[PDB]
């Protein structure tokens, strides 16, 4: 039922991401967050994270930093709601950090410093909200992946950015 | 030849400065690549120089150095200007340069470097202006259209509006 509503949102969200329609991407992800927030079930959040993951992936490979920010903002909102309502939110936290990882690697290889900063920032805030050893572990690996890709490509700014985020995740723990 | 190895030694210095962000050493090396091609006078030296330019611009873009990307784009224009004066059939040089400006603009747009995308569009226009052939105009419009569709997917209204103005001037200055 609400699975059908999200699947209709997924079609419109992905299509706007392929063409670069940042306004439609923003409103579809907003609708997807509302469907999961009204349902309140764990499956509704995971289905909404799947739409977020695919949109953020296309937006990152297209270089649309705005659509990346909106996707990762909704992904963070889903983690926030899951940490208050879902009994075992560790699966939702895994899905969100995986979506952040793909954005981070795509931006790091292309050299999109701004998209790297956002992905590293979101990984930092997801680890702070969850506060679990698994969330910190996955967040640091996202930072480690960006650092390795950036050092190989000689992107000093992305290396320095991953430097600061790694320390801030450590101090949060 | 020996010039193929002299250009490769210049590309090594130009790539290192592109990784480091030393935009002044990138420009100096690319000028030496232009001078090595100028003293040769053969179209194969100009083609190898364009490949040095293309390879340097991509490394600089992935390294997060937009100024080294823009200086590399400007050298590709000077290579066309030098090839127009010497080579009998510079159509192969112009085609390789316009496709090099295209691939660099695509990497620049996917990296969020809006200004490097603007410079690439301005270089495509000047290449069509200098080449003066109807083939080069068609190929320059194809580069601007490709960059426009890439910028549209990147959600960059600035580059789309800039490609719209460039595409108009290329049609007029023909």
Residue numbers in the entry:
A (entry chain B): 3 to 175
B (entry chain A): 2 to 175
Mind quoting what the paper says about this structure?
We set out to design proteins that can switch between two well-defined and fully structured conformations. We reasoned that these goals could be collectively achieved with a “hinge”-like design in which two rigid domains move relative to each other while remaining individually folded. The hinge amplifies small local structural and chemical changes to achieve large global changes while the chemical environment for most residues remains similar throughout the conformational change, avoiding the need for global unfolding. Designing one of the resulting conformations to bind to a target effector couples the conformational equilibrium with target binding.
The backbone conformation of the DHR serves as the first conformational state of our hinge protein (“state X”). We solved crystal structures for two designs, cs207 and cs074. For design cs207, crystals were obtained from two separate crystallization screens: one screen for the hinge alone, and one screen for the hinge in complex with the target peptide. In the absence of peptide the experimental structure agrees well with the state X design model, and the structure of the hinge-peptide complex agrees well with the state Y design model. The crystal structures of hinge cs207 in both designed states demonstrate the accuracy with which two very different conformational states of the same protein can now be designed.
